[PDB]
Design a protein around this ligand. Sequence first.
Ligand SMILES: [Zn+2]
Ligand SMILES: [Zn+2]
Ligand SMILES: [Zn+2]
Ligand SMILES: [Zn+2]
Lengths: 100, 97
Amino acid sequence: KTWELSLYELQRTPQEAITDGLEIVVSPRSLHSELMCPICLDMLKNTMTTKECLHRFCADCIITALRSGNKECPTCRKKLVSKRSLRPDPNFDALISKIY
Amino acid sequence: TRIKITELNPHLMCVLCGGYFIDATTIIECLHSFCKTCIVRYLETSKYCPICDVQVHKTRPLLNIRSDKTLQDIVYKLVPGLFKNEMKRRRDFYAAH
Ligand SMILES: [Zn+2]
Ligand SMILES: [Zn+2]
Ligand SMILES: [Zn+2]
Ligand SMILES: [Zn+2]
């Protein structure tokens, strides 16, 4: 990846925050599959993220998978040397703790 | 069931433009995220994360950033009108140019 910016991108301006009290309908989470872990199909909990490919799992599930001896990523099958190959992210955690 | 978007805002917003993530891009070292355009221009004059100050890469910062498909998916899904708005802005730009 070059990270070349296009003509539009060189000129783009912010997308301002919606600050008026608007509520979001999140009654079902069959609209938000990005908050569910691919292994256990639950709300991601203590989210671990792979450095190289940015796939997210519960700490529980990804440690187990690595401990099984299988070094591939469960989502994209790209190699992982170890647990130094993933980082925790409190951002996703805190996001999920607000929605459910 | 219903959550105030003002409660989710802080997790959906780029610290470099103060608006919502557009083409969210994450730093591999610390995992902080930004708009593509904001972090790319920033990393032209710095090799340290805007938020936590950690070194992104020894020499070539762009090596340790990634497109965050998942994060951008959430933002578009949660922030109503956001996606339609960005697409429109781009449509309006190319018609002008
Ligand atoms: Zn899991
Ligand atoms: Zn992966
Ligand atoms: Zn930005
Ligand atoms: Zn950081």
